[PDB]
Amino acid sequence: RIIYYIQAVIPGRAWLIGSNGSTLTVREGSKIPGYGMVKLIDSLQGRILTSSGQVIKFSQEDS
Amino acid sequence: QQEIQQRTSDMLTAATQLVQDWKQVETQVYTEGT
Amino acid sequence: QQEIQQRTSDMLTAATQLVQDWKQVETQVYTEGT
Amino acid sequence: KTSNTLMIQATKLYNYGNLAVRLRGLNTPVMLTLIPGQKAVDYRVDLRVQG
């Protein structure tokens, strides 16, 4: 399916890139396709919590 | 009791420093090439 | 007891020195050749 | 004043910004955003322009 990776994160926003190359930016309450509703943006440690229980991170060899 | 006032002085210096740091906004620079 | 305050003064000078040393960031230099 | 290469150095730790670049043939300038202080550092970024 599609996998999203953190490109940049500040307090408040997060810029994500997908495996198709599309780029998005999100805030605390926002819609993400295929993942659900954003519950918490943690600027430290690079973790994004999602309503489906998933955690959005950096690519492992690109981080 | 007097600790409120010593704290007021270090805090006053720090808050004045913070607000003067928040005041400055600098003009943008445009570069022309040929 | 008073040793806390003498220690505060040498430590204050050293920590101020450390933070002012951590503040400076210098501009890069580009060299053109022909 | 003639090439196609910029050299950027960040001066502050976490202050972020933006930049506008106008190329030779293009009329629309290309605007980019610049974020310092991440868990990765972009040593070099290559950009494909549409035109």
Automatic annotation (TrEMBL), chain A:
Record protein name field: DotF
Organism: Legionella pneumophila
Lineage per the UniProt record: Bacteria, Pseudomonadati, Pseudomonadota, Gammaproteobacteria, Legionellales
From TrEMBL, chains B, C:
Protein name: IcmE protein
Source organism, top-level taxon: Bacteria
Family label: Belongs to the TrbI/VirB10 family.
Residues represented out of the complete protein: 791 to 824 of 1048
Subcellular location: Membrane
